[model samples]
Target chain A: GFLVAAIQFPVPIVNSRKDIDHNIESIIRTLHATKAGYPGVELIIFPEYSTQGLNTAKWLSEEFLLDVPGKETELYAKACKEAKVYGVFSIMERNPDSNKNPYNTAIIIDPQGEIILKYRKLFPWNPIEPWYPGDLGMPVCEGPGGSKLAVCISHDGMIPELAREAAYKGCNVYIRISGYSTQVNDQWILTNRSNAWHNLMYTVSVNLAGYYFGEGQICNFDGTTLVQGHRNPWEIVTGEIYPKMADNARLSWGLENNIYNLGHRGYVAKPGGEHDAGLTYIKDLAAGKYKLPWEDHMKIKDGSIYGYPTTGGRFGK
Target chain B: GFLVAAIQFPVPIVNSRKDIDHNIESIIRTLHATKAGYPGVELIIFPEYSTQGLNTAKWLSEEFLLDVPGKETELYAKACKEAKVYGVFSIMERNPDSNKNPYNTAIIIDPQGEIILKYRKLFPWNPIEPWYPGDLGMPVCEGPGGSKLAVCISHDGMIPELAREAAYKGCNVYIRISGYSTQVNDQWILTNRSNAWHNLMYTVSVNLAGYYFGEGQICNFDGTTLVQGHRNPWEIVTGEIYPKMADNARLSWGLENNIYNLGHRGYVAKPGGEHDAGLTYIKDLAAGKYKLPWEDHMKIKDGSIYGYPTTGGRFGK
Candidate 1:
């Protein structure tokens, strides 16, 4: 078993450029150089918006994001090669080349020193309007090991549709990079893990071990580094995507593939040409449905209110 | 447009065989055959187990259900011929011919003496247990003027999945034959109706109109009958299915579909099937999934309840 890191910190979520760049660099170096008596692990992940925070996700459009082919991309690529480990690096990606839209992107750098995959957060929270919806075609890829690599940033799975889409896409191992103040779990963060796993039935959620900059308070590392399954609850994680049960999670329905058969007080309806006879689309969005994520996000507001999974519960801590 | 009779009976439902048989015969012989009221309804439907009551459906099994093509069926057919009106009959159909199983069934026969279509209740409620689960052998066939007819009884659409399936089955008109009688609108029957209409985009529901049997009262039909839109909560029915949209009263998913699409909670995850996705086997029952009757009557601890449908409240007065 490889040693996975919880990657704790005691800083606020809102980090300035200098602080973010330096802190990010420090974590990278420390992770590669080994710290606190543990052997330097090869694969590692951090919390949501570790550098920019979700509030600013809207600000970093394609112009503001640092593309992997650009300077920062080279920097992370070199780091991955030097460290000889896969890095689950999260950054607010702005496609500066074309000056298009920005993305709440997670960059997965393989050990071969190349940018293998990039996943843009489908739906951004309220403050994320500045960032347009994620671009389509974020494919799941095979990693150095047998891990099915995926990139998911902060709150990407807050809506089950997003996570379920990814899970349906063939992404068994998800690299969730998040940056929320550990304390924020109480005031702001609600239960979302249940929904994440419930959506497609299995997932890995990685968050900051502690708060970064918000209220600038020192916090302890709450060990919640785990992978959860709809059937089997959770599995301990070690900074990398773990191979999960390679099986289609039970699609919610009754016998003979009963479409629209789920009888519940809170049952909802889908549009035409949108679903098949089974009330479910067997061919689901594995990379998660990215066609106008925000539009879909706004589609179901009533049921989303209370159905979220949270930390201090199962998903968080 | 004629008198559409709905029978709402409370839980722990008890009924006298003599009373049931007599009332049925009276309704058929007197009101129906003679077209006693307002042109007389082209069809009359009883709630789930109108002879018994709501929430007690599952008690019926292959053993409990008599033959549909047997003496009872023949009586109904003769009644239809005599009434010169189509008969929408609800019963538990045990196929003595196949020895397969019994289904909570509804038979739609035309005055011309032909079985228009037969719908099996999809989602069975608690009170109806050991109620056999429904197959998709419903929502099939042509109706008056060869309308694309489909039938759903009771809790069919209550189950999120089942409702979606029926809609996807090209159900231009969805008929929910129910017997959900609670002293109060605990089942949210009115809201559920609007929800179904909105979710599926077009549907017509027939709820039993009667007093709560247990409390010597009537089920509260005080719920909203028509909703222009989710934002607009307007009553569509005033003690009767209004004539405003009576002719070809077609409900649609949207105003475009010649329907005022309720479009309630939009964009929900279903069985991942298409509107026609979860189609099991052609022989597996047409709309197969819950294809069940999930509708349940309100039960407040074996009766001590009030507030049933008031639509029939001022009837005798």
Candidate 2:
């Protein structure tokens, strides 16, 4: 079993670099306080945009984006080292390639103060979030208690494919961090539970609390809620999850071992379940020919519908 | 909006052909009663194993399996025509190819007494269910009110891929029928809601009640349970679902339009979103080279683990 804590707090908008530093310091303080309160907690997770809040006006400006593995991540690494626990932090990442747009990124810091996993948000909350499309595919890393960990930020978790990829890559503990408002409360809750149950993995999730959409929850492999926080801010929801259970479920030949059944579709009758390309969408997507039947009828194809400039800024040619 | 009804009742074991006739008669009566009571429910769905119960002792026998479009389906078609409502019914189907095993199949009959759709169970409840592997793949057909309909039986719904395929094929109302007992209550509920939310579709699900595991539910596009029935037998769960809502969400370029965003990932950053093959499992599966990292470690590969003979019956060489 691995002990993990998900923190929920009101993230302040970043008007300057000092705000990012202030948020990092607060995270450090929370890490120490959580360690003192729940002594065995091995991993602590903060919500998305923890360092840089949803200041949409400054999304295209480099002033709000932080350099990964730079001064800010160094402080987080030091904090993880001091607390003797692993941590997950999110930030508006400045693009190293000046030609591309910035990214909404999540990083995992190990106890030894090393960056273990870095994932850019694949499906950014489009029209609203202008983060560059994540080039790095879903990455799974080994974590405490032999757990395979994967993280997908806010809207990324909304896409079941991303979570399924994480599970297919053998992720046992999936972490999701969000910066959503109360309008998405139901979607957030159902997505968290479904992602956990569908993948047979433990899910650790937390959301920002300023728009008051705070409901940090930890779910078991069976999609049962182990612990959860309310709308109130500064709530730390913690749970001890058994990652081996996920491994056992995936390996078992039981009736409801879904992920295992996905590949080996009908092994009961066939020698090994049918390994045919049954899903057309998956086939079409891989072949770069994915087009919905109603694709031509779709009205919204770009961010121009939401009043964002069609070109220029980071993506300028 | 389309009105639908899901029925839950105790399915008796089939000891003779007369038993199958009795079950069909019950379904016909239920269909008439539902239309008269609900007065315009376009479609009515019955639970899996509705005609042939889980009599494991007689699974391999030809006596328990009925021929599709034979005497049984004719009676259902006549009843559907009489009631002027569409219907979904499950049957243990006899294999036309004598060398293969029987199939757990679901058939959809139109109001004109025409068979509109037929789906064989893709993932049979392994070890326990001995049905032949489904080969037709997930099929989506047109339903009332311009809604695209897809049906998956029992354990097939447990695999999210099947439901996703249904959504990908433009299914708005996904039907799931099961013969599960009390042990799978929570799983049934979560899978139903999750399948609806993840795909932005409506789900109508029902389970057998002899083991008294009856909880027929109808969920909307947002995964909210619109209506549900208790464990009592003969209870009908009814709801009015807006299939246009699903279409609107999928077509909208809004923030939480998950299924649309899945194909057009990060369209705000990229022109048409990245069209690359990012999901490795999907790429590998399409290439007929799907294998888990722990594939060699899986101990359960066939039905022999459950004391069933490895070779012989319909599958005998």
Candidate 3:
């Protein structure tokens, strides 16, 4: 019943927190403009590290980061309350659990200036990301109209499990907030499309638009924002998601609904057979029964589970 | 190090097993034709259920199915030996353990007329697909010149886990054999591309070309074929897998190589940061120490894993 938008914009490379206030205000302005233009807009999303560019060293510093519900989230909450819309904003979060490492986190603000969900980046892009790994697993929250929603940061969207986890947890709208360059164009489009189709849900993938520093290449990924409905793969990134289409596909539609009809007998996937059938592979996953090799094989120094596998030493200690 | 082609073509709805010999021969001719066109072609693959369409009710009969080293594998192995290249083909398989339910399986044949690897479809299309569930797990076999290889059939390719399992198992060239129609076009391309890029491998996906029965529509999901390499995202479907590119990226590249850099210190993903990272989540998974909430909620009919969770009946039953 609500409209959502992924605000694709650039982040400035700032060395200190003071340098980002102006840029943060600029983003708030855009958020306000979007909600004003689309009065029906319920939620709007910004890219990962939207306030701070890929400045890793600074992001790792306690001085440069803020806690969730800290300064940045409050401003976003203000913006959401002003527009009477929900907004998702990302920032380098001061680790509440520890004194040193900071977390890459995103928070959802309801229209009433209240926080709905606070999600940490689960699958941070490996050794390249300077911030500490995220601790929160995929969390689904209710929106203003009781819509199920979940958030996935940049690299997390690259893995299908993140989206699948959200969908199985009863999320219908999977919001991906990324700050990648055009290098992610192919994967960007593909994952969003498949994540939507497989889960029979909606995907709102917004990447950075303006230029930023990188390995000499521009940092912003495809400026073309991607928004897709559950079953309609025809529409590219430019289309808006219909609230009803996602809900209907999850509850009523039987054809190509791999999520529900998967293990059911006689589920017709394509155009064949009866109104029924597909797999229990997902149920096992959704229930979290299987063990991935990397899960135990890789670890950080203190015996904490490491997020990435290749860099993690090895399994069996 | 080599070129691989997935021979996408048509199959027929047949009443007797005799009708598919011509189709098999046609596939062999294409295998030769493809190699003849590209002399460097090291391997060739055909669609799942290549010899037969979605005629599951009849295919369940013993006469319609064959053993792995039986007639179908022999013919494919012979063709590969003659072509001096490797080949992957799918057929209805006879379950050695039992007599009634047949399995949908694909086998890899080397140049010496030997079966390299035989994989049953762990994730079948479900109730509509009457074939017995698969017993073989995802297995990666060594290919010509020492390239790692694996085969996934029809519905198995729909999910990323099958391909990821193959990639993590050390497969560089993953082949998908499917007889789906246009309905699979979007998902077909996305999963193949993401599967290749994410796993640092190559994916060659081919679907059925001609028409077959089912809801009066063609049996294939999509007609367009897809092929992709490990790192290059700009190239859509057709691209060369420079042996060095995959190796170098796997060995040296740190940024955006999530598979290797994951959980390691100093991992640099796209859009920002310089290497320097860490993780704790995966270790918990690898130890088989985690429990997802949905686990106890779903179970198989007899309490033994019905292989996959889909057919184990609805959750909470």
Name the docking class for model 2: medium
Over B30-124, each residue of candidate 2 has an lDDT whose tens digit, in order, gives: 89999999997999999998888877777568777888889889999999999988899998888888877888899999999999999988888
Which stretches in model 1 have alpha-carbon errors above 4 Å? A1-17, A33-42, A54-58, A61-64, A96-100, A127-129, A181-201, A208-275, A278-317, B1-61, B64-317
Q: Is candidate 1 or candidate 2 better by DockQ?
A: 2
Q: What is the TM-score of each predicted model, taking all chains together? A: 0.43, 0.96, 0.76
Question: For candidate 3 chain A, which ten residues in a row score worst on lDDT?
Answer: A214-223
Fraction of native contacts (fnat) of each candidate: 0.02, 0.64, 0.11
Q: Give interface RMSD, every candidate, in order.
A: 17.0, 1.9, 10.9
Task: Tell me model 2's lDDT, rounded to 2 decimals.
Answer: 0.83
Cα-based lDDT for every prediction: 0.40, 0.83, 0.58
The A-chain TM-scores of all the candidates are 0.60, 0.95, 0.75
Q: Give the per-residue lDDT of model 2 (tens digit) for A1-317.
A: 87999989778767876786788888888888988999899999999988877766665676777898798899889989988899999988888988778888999999999999999988888777677888889999989988999998988877777888998898999999888645878878877888888778998999988656689989888888889899887888888888997898777747767777777776777667778737888788778677778777777777776666656346522
Name the candidate that leads on TM-score.
Answer: 2
Q: Write the per-residue lDDT of candidate 3 for residues B1-317, one digit (tens) a residue.
A: 56666554657667776766766787788888877877887777677776765564466566677777777678788889999988888787776756335667888888898888988876656534655446566888988655777887767776565565675666766777766635545466555666677666666666665553111111111111233322221111223444444444455444455554332323322222222221211222233232222323322212112222343222211
List, residue by residue over A1-317, the lDDT tens digit for candidate 3.
55566665667667876768867897889888886777776777777767876664455555676777776778888888888888888887776656335678888888899988888776666545545556666888887455677888877766665666777677777788876544655566666666776676777777766563111111111111243322111111233445455665555433344554333322221212121112222223334343223334333222222332333222111
Candidate 2 vs candidate 3: the TM-score winner is 2
